Design a protein around this ligand. Sequence first.
Ligand SMILES: NC(=[NH2+])c1ccc2[nH]c(-c3cc(CC[NH3+])cc(-c4ccccc4)c3[O-])nc2c1
Ligand SMILES: [Ca+2]
Length: 223
Amino acid sequence: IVGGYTCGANTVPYQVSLNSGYHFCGGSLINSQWVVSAAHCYKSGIQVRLGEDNINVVEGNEQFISASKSIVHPSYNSNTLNNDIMLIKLKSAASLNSRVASISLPTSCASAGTQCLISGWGNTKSSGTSYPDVLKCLKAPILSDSSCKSAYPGQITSNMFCAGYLEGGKDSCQGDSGGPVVCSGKLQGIVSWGSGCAQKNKPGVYTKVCNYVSWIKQTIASN
Ligand SMILES: NC(=[NH2+])c1ccc2[nH]c(-c3cc(CC[NH3+])cc(-c4ccccc4)c3[O-])nc2c1
Ligand SMILES: [Ca+2]
């Protein structure tokens, strides 16, 4: 997260860290045994870390659970990042409390101007890499489809939306991918891509979760 602030330990109880010997993507806890993340974060050998704040130090509240399976959307296209979503089933269920809790899925899509909270342990520099030890937060608004389309012509599908600041300086970045975009207490987006990080007129692009609610429920129900 570039231009954000320190969230405060465990203030984002549904945030998870995907680890393969180092932190590589974020994710969101939607039930005690399932996490939602981005399809391009897929790999084998994933350990899900819940209740984290400082990813380099065990401080208490953490729960490390191996992933039993990962389900990448069947229509995911690695060239356009259309349908950039994945579900991960945990080997055992997490113990939910005030420090580890799930987030709710939306019942309707959100509109432009809605203000959301984006968090993660991704790069904090738009120019060079500096990855933090603690969880960073950023409040950003959903932009209009015309502003998004104008910014990335021919690259935005109906399963994506832009959020951020066209003036640059604030945005999600590499390492934040697969993490949550929460608006009014509902999971509306998944950090997916962008052209660089926090550049002017190049806002972040997020997977539009409201378009996958039925898929998510159907898939969890059959696995
Ligand atoms: N400006 C943004 N809002 C933004 C958001 C998420 C991003 N994720 C990435 C990203 C960039 C790279 C390096 C490509 N030269 C790699 C990954 C990546 C991470 C994990 C696994 C595979 C690729 C990214 O998610 N850039 C990003 C930029
Ligand atoms: Ca820790």
